[PDB]
Structure formats: C-alpha cells, structure tokens
Amino acid sequence: SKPLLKLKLLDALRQGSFPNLQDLLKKQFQPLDDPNVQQVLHLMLHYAVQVAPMAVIKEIVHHWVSTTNTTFLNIHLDLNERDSNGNTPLHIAAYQSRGDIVAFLLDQPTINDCVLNNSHLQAIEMCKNLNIAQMMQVKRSTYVAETAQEFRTAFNNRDFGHLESILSSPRNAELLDINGMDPETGDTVLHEFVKKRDVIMCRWLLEHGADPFKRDRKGKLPIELVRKVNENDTATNTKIAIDIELKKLLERATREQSVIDVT
C-alpha cells in the first residue's frame, strides 16, 4: 500500500498542479491514522523537490509547514524531515542542483541547514555545482551575522522571552555559540554579564550552556572578572554581597560544568 501511495503522489507531483495535488490528498490520502499515508506524506517535500515545479514546492511549504495554521492535511510537514539516508529536502535540492529551491528553503523561518545526513554531511556539502554552494555559504554567513545581532539585542535589553526563542532554535544550536566571541564586539556574553554584575542573567546563561572555563578575547575567565574581594560569606558583608554571590556562583559552576568547551 505504501508503494502505491508513493507512485500516486509522484504522479501528481510530476504533473505540476497544486490544486490537483490538494484534491488528491484530500480525497485519496485518508484516513489520517493510516501509517502508510502518514509515512508517505512525511516524505512529500522530498519527492516534490525531486520532480515538481517551483510553484508546487512553494504551495506545499506555505500551506502545510507553519504550526500556527490549521489545515485539512492535519499534519505539519517538517522542513527538516530526514529520510532513511538522513537527508533533508535541502540536501536533496542541493545535490540535484535546484538552486532556486535551495535559496527558497534557506529563507524559511524554520529551516535548519546544519542537519547532518548518515554520511555526516551538511546540505552544502552535497553540491556538485559550487555556484550553488557559494550562495549557500553567503546566505549562512548573513544569517549568522544577523543572529549574533539578534542575540545581542535580546541580552542587552534583558528580554528573557526573546532569549528563550533564540536559544531554543534548532538552527541556532550550531550557528550561535554562546561561548564564542561576538563578531562585532569580540566579547563573550557570560563575561560581559559578570562585569555587569547581573547575577540572574549569569545564572540563566550558565543554565543554557555558558562555560565558566571559557576565556574571552582578553584571555580572561569569567571568575577573573569578579571584583577582587576577600570574604566568602554574605553575612555582615552587605556592601559586597553581590560580588560574593557571583564568585560563589562561578565557583559552583566550575565544579558542575563537567564538559569543558574545547577550541
């Protein structure tokens, strides 16, 4: 039954009519609880990238990817769905030299161009056409710079909601290094908040991956940026309580870190 569904879907995709595809799915890809139906639908974007016109690929993505929209399909297609080879639609598009599809996918809100297939390759490495590879490299570099800016905006305005959205992004897990030097300031975030003496932000950063063993551009560890104070107990040391708290936090984090960032 799965082979039948695959052949049926590919036939509709090759014909290139989205309205026809929509009707086909609505009437023949039922019920929603059929395993084969679900499995083939999950690979629809892969198959579309292989045989369908740009217009169809665009309609598929705009109709069934965004989780904020309810549709008849009743399935939110994953733009980063991995097939049995670990390939995503972007991997397929890059290998098949469909530059326009590659660019379109890279412009989508939920795209993750860092997914590795079973051979440990990213989509950009699938390119035989290096002009397409160059375009992917430039688009990634632009995104990296804009995201570094987004992160700076969020932490400098102390917007935890925004920070949550930035660090929870699958793509940012690899394109935004909380322990790396910012491309514009050259500074490392934990260090900056230690100097700012914002302990709550420091705690938040540590819980989200910030490493107390990381040295910034000046070769300084976060703990070395704490005010040079003697006392280890806040009792009767009210005027340096924040500094003591900060020192204690970083000392504890240094013990708890477990995995030191290696560069």
Swiss-Prot record:
Repeat (ANK) residue spans along the chain: 40-69, 85-114, 185-214
Location of the protein in the cell: Golgi apparatus membrane; Nucleus outer membrane; Endoplasmic reticulum membrane; Vacuole membrane
Origin superkingdom: Eukaryota
Family: Belongs to the OSBP family.
Subunit record text: Interacts with NVJ1. Interacts with the AAA ATPase AFG2; regulates OSH1 membrane association. AFG2 is required for membrane dissociation of OSH1. Interacts with SCS2.
Protein role: Lipid transport protein (LTP) involved in non-vesicular transfer of lipids between membranes. Functions in phosphoinositide-coupled directional transport of various lipids by carrying the lipid molecule in a hydrophobic pocket and transferring it between membranes through the cytosol. Involved in maintenance of intracellular sterol distribution and homeostasis. Involved in non-vesicular transport of ergosterol and PI(4)P at the NVJ. Binds sterol and PI4P in a mutually exclusive manner. May be involved in formation of PMN vesicles by altering the membrane lipid composition.
Domain notes: The ankyrin repeats are required for targeting the protein to the NV junction by interacting with NVJ1. The PH domain strongly binds to phosphoinositides and is required for targeting the protein to the late Golgi membranes.
Protein name, as recorded: Oxysterol-binding protein homolog 1
Organism name: Saccharomyces cerevisiae (strain ATCC 204508 / S288c) (Baker's yeast)
Gene: SWH1
Residues of the full protein shown: 12 to 274 of 1188
